[PDB]
Amino acid sequence: ARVIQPGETPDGTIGRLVKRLGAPAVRTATRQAMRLMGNHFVLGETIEQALERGKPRSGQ
Amino acid sequence: MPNIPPPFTAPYAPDDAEIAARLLPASHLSPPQEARIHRTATRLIEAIRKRRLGGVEDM
């Protein structure tokens, strides 16, 4: 948990995005990225985690 | 109590440049005035770009 001081120059890939689209649109875009990553990729810190996450219901 | 103004009759299509010669200098604002405007306006546009259903332009 950091503490973000106001008036920070928007830099970086995200800061440049924020300057261009505005912070609210970046949040919205990030939320969309979250549904894409969650729905279309089967990922984990290790292969075991990915595989467990990608499993079907049962006897299926 | 003042006089009822005469029927309106301003020149229909005066020269743009002469108008601009008046409006351009008068439009000047101090740095702090512009700073408030910039901030308010950025906040308005951020809200606009939040994205609600939409409007005709969106369609």
Alpha helices in chain A (DSSP H): 12-21, 23-40, 47-53
The experimental technique used to determine this model is X-ray
CA-closest candidate to residue A42, choices A51, A29, A33: A51
Which residues of A, range 31-60, sit inside 8 Å of B by Cβ? none
CA-based nearest distance A20→chain B, Å:
10
Burial (CB count within 10 angstroms: exposed 0-12, middle 13-18, buried 19+), residue B11 = exposed
- The amino acid sitting at A6 is P
A44 token code pair: 């984990």
- Which tokens go with B23? 């409006």
Q: Is A24 exposed, middle or buried (0-12, 13-18, 19+ CB in 10 A)?
A: middle
Query: How far A24 CA lies from chain B's nearest CA (Å)?
Result: 5
B51 touches A25 (CB < 8 A): yes
- In sign, the C-alpha dihedral spanning B40, B42, B46, B52 is positive
> What is the structure's resolution, reported in angstroms to one decimal?
2.1
